[PDB]
Amino acid sequence: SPRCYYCNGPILDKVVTALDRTWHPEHFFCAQCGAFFGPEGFHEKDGKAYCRKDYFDMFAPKCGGCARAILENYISALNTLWHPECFVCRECFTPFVNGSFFEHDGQPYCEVHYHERRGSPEYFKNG
Ligand SMILES: [Zn+2]
Ligand SMILES: [Zn+2]
Ligand SMILES: [Zn+2]
Ligand SMILES: [Zn+2]
């Protein structure tokens, strides 16, 4: 049976396969972002485990789904790096110089637009 070398102990529950070796679930964590739940097909580097996103980070910042190479200015949000201008609501489409990054429905939003969305459950007079 498989044995967790990280704690030199036996493995009863689900065993994770890495570097042709067996490791425990609680003893197995991404050494890059350290926060996995249940991905599929990860890349190995230097005997380490990196998420799909971490793999790209090692090379360069890329938009989740806009472009490849990101200019100088960049913004790290949702564990992913996206362009500075890409950070805009699908309605305003314009950036709102403020500072912190706002996340909404897995997409970038403005400070006023972000709070305005949480203001009401469905809609309201303002907006
Ligand atoms: Zn272990
Ligand atoms: Zn990771
Ligand atoms: Zn982008
Ligand atoms: Zn906006």
Cα–Cα distance list, 106 to 30, 48, 77 (Å): 22, 28, 9
- Say which ligand is closest to the CA of 91: 4
Task: Flag whether 127 is in a domain.
Answer: no
Distance, CA 29 to ligand 1 centroid (Å)? 11
Query: In this structure, which ligand is nearest to the CA of 32?
Result: 2
Method used to obtain the model: NMR
Do 103 and 89 share a structural domain?
yes
Calpha distance 69→102 (Å, rounded): 23
Closest ligand to Cα 73? 3
- Same domain for 14 and 67, yes or no, is no
User: Which residues are bridge partners to 81 per DSSP?
Assistant: 76
Residues 7 and 44 in one domain: yes
| Domain housing 68 | 58-119
Q: How far apart are CA 21 and CA 124, in angstroms?
A: 56
Residue 12 belongs to domain with CATH number:
2.10.110.10
Same domain, yes or no, for 46 and 64?
no
Residues 6+ apart with CB under 8 A from 123: none
DSSP 71: -
Same domain, 53 and 71: no
1 CA distance to ligand 3 centroid (A)?
47
Same domain, 68 and 96: yes
Closest listed residue to residue 107, CA positions, set 126, 89, 91, 119: 89
- Alpha-carbon distance of 27 to 34, in angstroms, equals 11
Ligand nearest to the Cα of 2, by number: 1
Which residues are CB-neighbours of 120 under 8 A, at least 6 positions away?
none
Q: Tell me, yes or no, whether 31 and 66 share the same domain.
A: no
The answer to the question of residue 125 being in a domain is no
Q: Are residues 72 and 44 in the same domain?
A: no
Q: Which ligand is nearest to the CA of 57?
A: 2
Ligand having the closest approach to the CA of 6:
1
Give the distance, in angstroms, between the CA of residue 1 and the centroid of all CA atoms in the same chain. 34
- List, as ranges, residues with CB under 5 A of the ion ligand 3: 63, 66, 83, 86
CA of 74 to the centre of ligand 1 (A): 38
112 plus 63 within the same structural domain? yes
Domain count, the chain: 2
Picking from 35, 57, 79, the residue at the C-terminal end of a domain is 57
